[PDB]
């Protein structure tokens, strides 16, 4: 398993919008069965270690093959500080 | 269990994973998650 936390996930394997996420935070839980219980390997997608924000939208649908298809849009506010580049 | 929201008729229904991703009213295959039960705060800055 990943070194991040897993308490921010609901019972459907997805995170609800409105919860603040930080670096190394699981947002989409996914497992893969191991071919020959614990016979499963983790295949989740955590957040970037240099990105902290708040989950805004979660889309869940089906692709062309028929399996599940999830998308998580995280929003954040960037405030100009020392180091930002501007141009006339 | 988990509240959902349809992308066309905007119907609030709940599915238990095993149910397919579909709407129980207009049949739209595009749904979204609902707002979490936790309180969202801000510093107003």
């Amino acid at each position: 398993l990943k070194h991040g936390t897993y308490e921010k996930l609901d019972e459907d394997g997805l995170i609800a919008p409105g919860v603040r996420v930080s670096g190394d935070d699981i947002i989409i839980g996914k497992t893969t069965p191991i071919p020959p219980y614990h016979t499963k390997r983790d295949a989740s997608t955590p957040l970037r270690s240099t990105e902290n924000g708040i989950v805004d939208q979660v889309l869940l649908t089906t692709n062309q093959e028929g399996l599940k298809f999830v998308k998580v849009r995280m929003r954040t506010t960037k405030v100009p500080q020392i180091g930002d580049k501007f141009a006339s | 269990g988990v509240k959902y929201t349809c992308g066309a008729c905007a119907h609030n229904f709940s599915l238990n994973k095993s149910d397919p991703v579909r709407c129980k009213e207009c049949g739209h295959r595009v749904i979204y998650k609902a707002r979490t039960k936790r309180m969202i705060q801000f510093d107003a800055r």
Binding site: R20, S22, N52, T76 | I40, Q41, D43
Partner: peptide
């Protein structure tokens, strides 16, 4: 503790927190 308003984690003493439960925020007696 990672706060919700800013994007940073801070160290805080134990006597400066309030944990939630089934009725309000319970202090160290939780």
């Amino acid at each position: 503790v990672e706060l919700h308003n800013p994007n940073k984690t801070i160290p805080i003493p134990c006597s400066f927190l309030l944990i939630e439960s089934t009725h309000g925020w319970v202090p160290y007696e939780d």
